[PDB]
Amino acid sequence: LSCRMAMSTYEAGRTVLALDFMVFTLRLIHIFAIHKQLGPKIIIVERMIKDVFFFLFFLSVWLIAYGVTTQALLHPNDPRIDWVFRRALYRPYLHIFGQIPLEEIDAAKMPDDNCTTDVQEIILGTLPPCPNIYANWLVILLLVIYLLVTNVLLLNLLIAMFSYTFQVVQENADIFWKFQRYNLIVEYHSRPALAPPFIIISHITQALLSFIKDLLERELPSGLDQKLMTWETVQKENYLAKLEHEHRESSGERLRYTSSKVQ
């Protein structure tokens, strides 16, 4: 909004507000904690992130290699740095999602466009540069190998990682969701009773009452507190006695007793 109030930064303000809408929308993920089916998925996504980081390291290495190699082989005379980075990382990254523009990589499929080789004309953007087709069989072979590796090996390996991580996490994810649901319930327990923009009313009321003047964490009378302490102690004794009893009648203890007694 501050950048929006000024003409010299107006488009920047609009851009920042648009990017902030994404943050506000993603803040809506919190409500999913209450639902039992939608709860653990958020926690599972967190481990999915780490597997994604591993896959991104592998992708980054292999993609840098392939993209720089093909940019060197195909457009060796293009000085435009932005286009170097485009052809070296942006295009190979899109190759993962089925975007393979063979019109720029395969000599047979290149359009009969009007392209130039002069550096001055290339830099000024008058004409698109004419791709080098010296050894294009190498470019096609490298593209085939890259597609194989990235789309099959790497993607299926990431699917395997996700599958294994899901199987491992599933048990602990429910416990994490239970804790998250506790946190959500406590937060909405402490929250004032009116949703914003109305909240303003509750805040004004609270401040006015504070100037003018729980279900959880309640303190009990002395007698009830003492009775609860005694009841907890009795339950603890019963629990320990049950443990000791089930230990005495365990198979191993019975065998040890029988062996000593028979000896």
Ligand X SMILES: C[C@@H]1CC[C@@]2(OC1)O[C@H]1C[C@H]3[C@@H]4CC=C5C[C@@H](OCC[C@H](CO)CO[C@@H]6O[C@H](CO)[C@@H](O[C@H]7O[C@H](CO)[C@@H](O)[C@H](O)[C@H]7O)[C@H](O)[C@H]6O)CC[C@]5(C)[C@H]4CC[C@]3(C)[C@H]1[C@@H]2C
Ligand Y SMILES: C[C@@H]1CC[C@@]2(OC1)O[C@H]1C[C@H]3[C@@H]4CC=C5C[C@@H](O)CC[C@]5(C)[C@H]4CC[C@]3(C)[C@H]1[C@@H]2C
Q: Which residues bind ligand Y (CB under 6 A)?
A: 81-82, 85
Does 103 appear as a known binding residue? Answer: no
With CB under 8 A as the rule, give the number of residues binding a copy of itself.
114
Shortest Cβ distance from residue 242 to a copy of itself (Å)?
8
Write phi, then psi, for 110 (nearest 5 degrees): -70, 135
Least Å distance between CB 122 and a copy of itself?
A: 13
Residue 61 or 160 having the CB closest to ligand Y: 61
For the chain, state the CA radius of gyration: 33
Burial class (CB in 10 A: 0-12, 13-18, 19+), 63: buried
Query: Would you count residue 125 as binding ligand X (CB under 6 A)?
Result: yes
Q: Is the peptide bond before 197 cis (omega within 30 degrees of 0)?
A: yes
Q: Which of 32, 58, 62, 83 binds ligand X (CB under 6 A)?
A: 83
Name the nearest CA neighbour of 119 among 82, 87, 81, 80.
80
Residue 19 CB, shortest distance to ligand X, in Å, is: 15
β-strand partners of 116: 129
Whether the link from the prior residue into 128 is cis, omega within 30° of 0, is no
List residues near ligand X by CB under 6 A.
60, 63, 80, 82-83, 85-86, 89-90, 93, 107-108, 110, 125, 133, 137, 140-141, 144
Known binding residues for Ca(2+): 187
